Amino acid sequence: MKTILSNQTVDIPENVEITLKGRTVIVKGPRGTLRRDFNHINVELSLLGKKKKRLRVDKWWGNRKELATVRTICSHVQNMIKGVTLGFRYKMRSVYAHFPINVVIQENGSLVEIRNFLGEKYIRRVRMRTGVACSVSQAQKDELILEGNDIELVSNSAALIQQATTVKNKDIRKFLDGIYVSEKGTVQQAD
């Protein structure tokens, strides 16, 4: 019905600095930096306040389908702040009912080599997206920790790893085997 104004405010901590040359948002924090182009949203972004620096997102004369993106923008900024402050760590555990899945890292966790998945001789090589590092965690059996900054990259690499081990021509209910993302959290705690 062409709503007049739709505004959403996002708070910013003291650790991270955020900047905008336009719809482009750049967040600089303790662990690396993030930058995203929002040229396909068509929404106003303005930071205001000293020592607080709250970011408001404003939409004027938007329909029911256009008023939805003003919250997705704030959610993306929240995810960027969370990843640049604490980071995103996905623990993926592998179910290996009979055949043990042998996962190894190739080059600084940028490449995952999976051997002996359901007894197949095929070697599955999955490369991680830039900025995501994977490792075999200790004090636990058959798990992989994938740590990074950008959530849309960490979860993308996790989904790639999960879909690499997929049963074919067999039952999906039966033959429960493969690496599934068990836990999702941050690298830094107490926040």
């Binding site: 019905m1 062409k2 709503t3 007049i4 104004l5 004027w60 004369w61």
Partner: protein, 175 residues
Amino acid sequence: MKASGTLREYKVVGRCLPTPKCHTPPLYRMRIFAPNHVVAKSRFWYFVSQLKKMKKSSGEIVYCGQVFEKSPLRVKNFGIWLRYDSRSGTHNMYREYRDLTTAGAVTQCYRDMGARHRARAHSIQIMKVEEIAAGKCRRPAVKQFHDSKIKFPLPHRVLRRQHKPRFTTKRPNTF
């Protein structure tokens, strides 16, 4: 009915011919929205025939006068009652509009009905038009304007002059 251009309010009074069985008819009055007095009288005859036993031959129109708005400079809110007829069946409706004139609100109602429901002017019966206050406005599209200190820009304004400098080295800033 065509409802071409802008509509006009007409107060139309009418009564049956004095018959030997009874004289001095009740002289019924109506308030019709029509582009001109001819179709105003026609619609008045149609409505009074649908309501009571009256026809153009057995009856007559005493007075038909243009009605001007009592406050053309004030922004008012109007509640329109519709008795429209769809492709399947006829339905009643209550709409709300914001305009300066009653005829303007009726024009907006006709255009909005024809646009949103594909209802031609043939099957639209304006039941009641009354000015309502801002407190009794149930429509959110109208209620969103009952706020003082209202501020909003005009973003992405069209060029509107695409063909006057049809050939140029410019790219419109649109801001």
